[PDB]
Design an enzyme around this catalytic site. Sequence first.
Site, PDB file in Angstrom:
ATOM      1  N   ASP A 179      15.018 -19.497  -0.972  1.00  0.00           N
ATOM      2  CA  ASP A 179      16.114 -18.823   0.494  1.00  0.00           C
ATOM      3  C   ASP A 179      15.131 -19.388   2.163  1.00  0.00           C
ATOM      4  O   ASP A 179      14.240 -18.610   1.740  1.00  0.00           O
ATOM      5  CB  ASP A 179      16.881 -17.893   0.185  1.00  0.00           C
ATOM      6  CG  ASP A 179      17.599 -17.032   1.897  1.00  0.00           C
ATOM      7  OD1 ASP A 179      17.104 -16.410   2.675  1.00  0.00           O
ATOM      8  OD2 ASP A 179      18.554 -18.363   1.771  1.00  0.00           O
ATOM      9  N   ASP A 198      17.117 -13.334  -0.248  1.00  0.00           N
ATOM     10  CA  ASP A 198      16.880 -11.485   0.689  1.00  0.00           C
ATOM     11  C   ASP A 198      18.545 -11.025   0.880  1.00  0.00           C
ATOM     12  O   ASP A 198      18.934 -10.425   1.489  1.00  0.00           O
ATOM     13  CB  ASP A 198      16.800 -11.685   2.385  1.00  0.00           C
ATOM     14  CG  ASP A 198      17.405 -12.387   3.058  1.00  0.00           C
ATOM     15  OD1 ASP A 198      17.807 -12.115   3.878  1.00  0.00           O
ATOM     16  OD2 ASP A 198      17.629 -13.258   3.012  1.00  0.00           O
ATOM     17  N   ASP A 214      22.254 -14.798  -2.366  1.00  0.00           N
ATOM     18  CA  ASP A 214      21.244 -15.251  -3.364  1.00  0.00           C
ATOM     19  C   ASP A 214      21.614 -14.543  -5.315  1.00  0.00           C
ATOM     20  O   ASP A 214      20.487 -14.447  -5.737  1.00  0.00           O
ATOM     21  CB  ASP A 214      19.761 -15.315  -2.178  1.00  0.00           C
ATOM     22  CG  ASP A 214      19.326 -15.592  -1.603  1.00  0.00           C
ATOM     23  OD1 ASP A 214      19.607 -16.636  -1.391  1.00  0.00           O
ATOM     24  OD2 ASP A 214      18.934 -15.272  -0.468  1.00  0.00           O
TER      25      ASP A 214
HETATM   26 MG   LIG Z   1      18.311 -14.718   4.081  1.00  0.00          MG
END
Ligand SMILES: [Mg+2]
EC number: 7.2.2.13
Lengths: 39, 268, 992
Positions: free
Chosen positions: C345, C686, C690
């Site tokens: 990410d 995070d 995800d």
């Molecule tokens: Mg992120």
Amino acid sequence: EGPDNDERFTYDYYRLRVVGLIVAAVLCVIGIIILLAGK
Amino acid sequence: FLGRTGSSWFKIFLFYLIFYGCLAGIFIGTIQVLLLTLSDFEPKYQDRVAPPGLSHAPYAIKTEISFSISNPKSYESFVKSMHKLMDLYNESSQAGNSPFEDCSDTPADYIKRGDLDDSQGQKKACRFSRMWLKNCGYAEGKPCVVAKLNRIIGFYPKPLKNTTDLPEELQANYNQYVLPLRCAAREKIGSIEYFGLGGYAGFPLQYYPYYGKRLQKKYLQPLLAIQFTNLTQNMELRIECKVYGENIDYSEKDRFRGRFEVKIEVKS
Amino acid sequence: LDELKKEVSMDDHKLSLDELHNKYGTDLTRGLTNARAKEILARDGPNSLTPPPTTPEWIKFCRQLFGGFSILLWIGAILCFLAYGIQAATEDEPANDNLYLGVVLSTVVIVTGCFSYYQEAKSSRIMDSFKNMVPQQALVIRDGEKSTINAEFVVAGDLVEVKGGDRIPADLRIISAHGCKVDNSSLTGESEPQTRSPEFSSENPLETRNIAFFSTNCVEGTARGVVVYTGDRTVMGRIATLASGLEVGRTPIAIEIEHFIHIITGVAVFLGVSFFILSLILGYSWLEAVIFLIGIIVANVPEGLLATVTVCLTLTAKRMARKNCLVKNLEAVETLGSTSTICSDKTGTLTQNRMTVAHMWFDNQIHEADTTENQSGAAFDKTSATWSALSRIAALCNRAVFQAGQDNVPILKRSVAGDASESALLKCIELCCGSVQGMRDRNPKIVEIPFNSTNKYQLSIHENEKSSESRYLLVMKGAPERILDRCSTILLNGAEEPLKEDMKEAFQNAYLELGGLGERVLGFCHFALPEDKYNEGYPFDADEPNFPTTDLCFVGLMAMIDPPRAAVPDAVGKCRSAGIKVIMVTGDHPITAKAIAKGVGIISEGNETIEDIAARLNIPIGQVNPRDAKACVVHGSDLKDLSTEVLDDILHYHTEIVFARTSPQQKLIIVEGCQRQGAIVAVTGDGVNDSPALKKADIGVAMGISGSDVSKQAADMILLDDNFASIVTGVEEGRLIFDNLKKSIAYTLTSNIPEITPFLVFIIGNVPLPLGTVTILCIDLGTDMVPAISLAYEQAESDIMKRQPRNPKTDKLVNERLISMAYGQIGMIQALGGFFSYFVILAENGFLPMDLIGKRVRWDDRWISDVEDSFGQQWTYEQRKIVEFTCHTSFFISIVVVQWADLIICKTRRNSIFQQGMKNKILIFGLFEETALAAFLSYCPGTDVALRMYPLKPSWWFCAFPYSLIIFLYDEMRRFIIRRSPGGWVEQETYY
Ligand SMILES: [Mg+2]
Ligand SMILES: *[C@@H]1O[C@H](CO)[C@@H](O[C@@H]2O[C@H](CO)[C@@H](O)[C@H](O)[C@H]2NC(C)=O)[C@H](O)[C@H]1NC(C)=O
Ligand SMILES: CC(C)CCC[C@@H](C)[C@H]1CC[C@H]2[C@@H]3CC=C4C[C@@H](O)CC[C@]4(C)[C@H]3CC[C@]12C
Ligand SMILES: *[C@@H]1O[C@H](CO)[C@@H](O)[C@H](O)[C@H]1NC(C)=O
Ligand SMILES: [K+]
Ligand SMILES: [K+]
Ligand SMILES: [K+]
């Protein structure tokens, strides 16, 4: 000795055990010392 | 193939052949040096045989010899081992002044044939007649057990002195020259009868010390025949034969350390 | 099952408000009926998420109790009770042997079960985190009246109302809104507020303004909407199910464990039954044939090995806990070392997740600011009088403020009330000009025009802090081009000057460059109003232009971006040097995604996309050979119409990949694509978007401070300080533990041979038993334990970060080379050293080696209390047994003595001990404690009963010394050959 050779069929397993246990303990302490040199 | 090519399969064989060959050669080398440090006449240690064991001829199934008097093949098993032992004490086996010697027909003192050396030939052993074993096919009824003291090189079995009290209190106490053997069971439902050298219920000290197989082959150890003409029948009787001496001791674990454990039962 | 959920969603934002009501039997104004709502409740079911069915811990524990070694140990334990049963019936055996050994072995299985159970842990509460995002209550309009209801009682069709501060209770079709902004970070990973209005604004429902989603929250304003989806049927409720439902799967390390279990189990059953028949042929009673088999089992199975592995893993996880890297699953300690591909990410992972000033354009010059958290860069300018003029506008023409009580925390980390751009500017000036509040106190704001959608600028009028003036200063900021159309002069190095086409062109150049860097650019200008035309009491009208807004003085430009975390660029390069492929997978827009890719080193300098080639050469993209482009940037909207085979080609054909504007399922798809090619993949993230990717990853790593609760539930590892450098450490630790496990496994296995061989020679030679079953357990469960563990503290023998990731198909944890060395070479030398001491003990007590062959018959005969030795002496039963058990004791001690050397040689696979040294203090500890344990077990009174251990004479200890030394020399010579010729012979045969 001659007829008085009783010592030939004898062994001080008691002392050997005392010494063996002393050694085992001291090796155990020595090990702690080296390990604890930083934790 | 499985792992590799033929060329690789070969090389892995050439390696392990030389490798294991070397290892075998090294192992043998260490065995050589071990043997080189040992005597031919006497073992390095003797503290593990120290207190002599007492063993008998009747091959006990489990420290027990039960059978039926009214049956032939009921005791023919115990007679096999009994024969095996006594067959060795034949007179035809003890011929000439070599390597046997006529010793006192009465319990005597020790005999030192020098040291544990080859500086002399085969150390001459005392003769022993199976004919000293009175009364004892064997006892088809009420067995005639044969006792024996385990051989130990350089061991001088020392009898107890009549200073204080004794089990068989002072009876026929040949204090100076006899290692006694008194069998027991309270529970006194038997009839102990002992046979041996000089008619004594012990081992004649003139057969000691033992010089070992290498310095004394054909050597004969003294026997002590014991007969239980018990007036009882059809019950397990725990009979313990005990030897007494200065160099004789016992253990709760080793039930053969200078003593017997016989469970006779004439279930007839 | 979940293949449906891996697809992009379909919606009804295209319908009119009225049309949408027909579909759901609803009223736009009155809302649903109390009766109709309750009807729909029973129909569709609750607005809730149901957690997936889990496997109870019962079945999880017991599943370990039947994995190769445990199976063999079970066969042993029962076979003990078998022989015991056969005894208790036949001849009354008052002993406890088979009974107790059967109890001991069954305990070994249970305890070993706990260790593997502890290792195979799965702490997963994905669906629980998602459930936390549904509010307890919602506001609905029913029978023309608004009431709060249990949010679970919400159904498709009713009229819902939301306002700033509340969570979207369900997927809504916006029908009415007033200044409504929403935080869609759940779906995008981006927290910038998105406007919501009734008007449809994109074909894509995840981008349109007239849809609001469950799992997000309203940030400001008010809105009303019609519920289109409820519970599991919402967009993120499906993501929830997808994430929670995904099959976990076996880790690389787990697969390795099972693999050597098969090997060792194989040789165990082989030799087991190979000698079971070999005994019956020799005329051994089944009574004995089973007793030998039990011994064979105990000899072949390394009883303490699986637990060693677990402890070595645990200890490695403890070290990483001490670098702010939390491991939730013990196996994930190794996966990072086997990782060949990282899918990362961007926002809050690679980046700080905070709009930060990156560059400034003043004095006809581009200046760069420091974007790093801890400010690890340098200054750009302080001297220029122009800077102070620009700095003043950035502070004054700004409505952002620091939250109360932050004075303790660093400037860049403190919470700010305001939009991202104003916060960035605030923190910029506060950093390099001190307290901004001071500047706003020295220059009192009298009138302002806040940033307007139409004006595209924000202006402010302040009392000049200067005493000699104390007059009125005008400042404004806005779109760079709009600010330009309002300027006549430029503050160059202090003094103003006319805005000639020259500087105007340099402005465009500066503007295009900064924008090309993916940075948001703002214009800044001011105007000192004429004193005579503006008295100290002159009133300014903000509603109607009461003051000039043209012919102003352009001061400068400022650019900003959500920047990389300081450690990220360097960590990315380090991953790439270790041969790990790094891919970006983000919900963010392509221009931003691509710019950070270059910033952190995902896309290296000079590498081009097909679009780059086309623009440079000024040719159509179809005219470009796509193989000429090693880099690519894929938008999610294009990803959607590509098959997996085509996704596989993208993955194969590019070294530098950026997946931008991806949905959560799309992240999962990219991860699966990478895995499909046979790669071990890590995911770093995070956000809740995800979660599926993190779950599917061989190892998911979540950020600890910036991470959402969901992401950290889906992960195997948490970076508690958001230190991306930890990934680099993790992969390094992962590789090191992999090598050290080999060392520890070889060490443990080596001692199997000296435990097997005595039992074999017992049969083939008919000699007294050299070593007992109990004695074996004193080794594998006792003495070898601490030494085997200590190998986990071994330093690397070379630069492990310099090698490529292991090939999980070829590079195994236990291979033929390990067995050859442990079983064929070193263990064989240990066996002899054991036997030697055995022959020494017996020969020194009177039984010379020659007379031992074929004596066991009379030796074991309990009724022969007169066995003749070599010297003609007669032994009772218990007497010779004491010597025999003393033989077991010295054979045992011989193993310990030969394991001394083995411990030292297993220290290194390649290097010499004279190179690696003896700096492992745990290892040395192992040596001392191992020897202490052995001595204690031999000399402690009473151990002759409980373990049949007998006191050894001093000379006995030294029997195996020459064998211990040969091991040290042999292995040192062998490894000397390895190093001296990287060719292959010694290497390809023995190199673990
Ligand atoms: Mg992120
Ligand atoms: C040792 O003495 C025993 C005494 O019983 C011998 O047994 C003899 O066996 C033969 C042939 O089987 C019989 O004819 C005799 O009746 C047995 N007794 C005697 C006194 O001769 C036995 O053969 C002898 N063993 C050896 C090796 O000489
Ligand atoms: C007690 C004694 C008699 C048993 C001796 C067993 C010997 C023959 C065994 C023990 C370990 C074995 C080796 C272990 C490892 C390998 C590597 C593999 O790729 C091919 C087989 C090979 C080379 C084995 C061949 C046979 C081997 C050398
Ligand atoms: C033993 O045998 C002798 C003959 O040799 C006999 O006189 C005696 O009765 C026997 N003794 C016993 C107790 O049966
Ligand atoms: K084992
Ligand atoms: K995972
Ligand atoms: K082992």
